Amino acid sequence: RMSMVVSGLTPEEFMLVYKFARKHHITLTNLITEETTHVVMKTDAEFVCERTLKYFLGIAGGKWVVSYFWVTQSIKERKMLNEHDFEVRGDVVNGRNHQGPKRARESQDRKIFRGLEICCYGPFTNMPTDQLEWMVQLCGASVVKELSSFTLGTGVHPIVFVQPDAWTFHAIGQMCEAPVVTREWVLDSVALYQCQELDTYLIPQIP
Ligand SMILES: [Co+2]
């Protein structure tokens, strides 16, 4: 059936979702899994939310990323409103209207990271490696654990991403032949659901 997960909400805001969840036989839960169908985000009146991890994984699964206004209007009108009307416009960081989740629902037959080998490299911070790995998988990429493990083949394009405010490196180029980008290449590529160009994102590689 329907299974719901919640993001950016207060206790009382949560209680409202639960009431809506109880009234409509919807499972509510703490952590997002593949079983999750809906991700309720807090937004401003014009469906703009902050980009949480559940935001990305939600879009990565191409679920229903939908504003908390879905919940309260549904309570107000005493009926389960259309998810279509309430979906999240975009976010505070990628722009007030990129309609990201929209494309993601519409494009499961061709996922943006199809045909790619991705290596989430070294230390990571707000987001753990495995979440980013699962994100990246969900969008049709193939995870590599170590640089040396890239399918050296005309077939696939390998990418290495890193987030550099963690290593408390620019010599990945010396250990493998791959584009090195910044974790924001993935996050934006997922937020916008377009496959971003690596130029704006490349980390310098010393010879
Ligand atoms: Co090519």
Descriptive overview:
There is one protein chain. The protein has 2 domains: about 110 residues, 3-Layer(aba) Sandwich (Rossmann fold), CATH 3.40.50; about 100 residues, Rossmann fold. The protein starts with a strand and ends in a 16-residue tail after the last helix. With about 210 residues, the protein is of the alpha/beta class. It binds cobalt (II) ion. It comes from Homo sapiens (Human). It is found in: Nucleus; Chromosome; Cytoplasm.
Structural class by sheet pairing and helices: alpha/beta
> Describe the biggest sheet?
4 strands, parallel
From the 3D structure, determine the CATH topology of the largest domain: Rossmann fold
Helix coverage percent of residues? 25-40%
Strand order of the largest sheet: 2-1-3-5
Question: What's the architecture of the largest domain in CATH terms?
Answer: 3-Layer(aba) Sandwich
Number of self-contained structural domains: 2
Q: CATH H level of the largest domain: which superfamily? A: BRCT domain
**CA-based gyration radius:** 19 Å
Terminal CA distance reads 54 Å
PDB class: antitumor protein
Keywords: brca1, brct, Phospho-peptide, missense mutation, antitumor protein
Assembly: monomeric
Entry title: Structural basis of phosphopeptide recognition by the BRCT domain of BRCA1: structure of BRCA1 missense variant V1809F
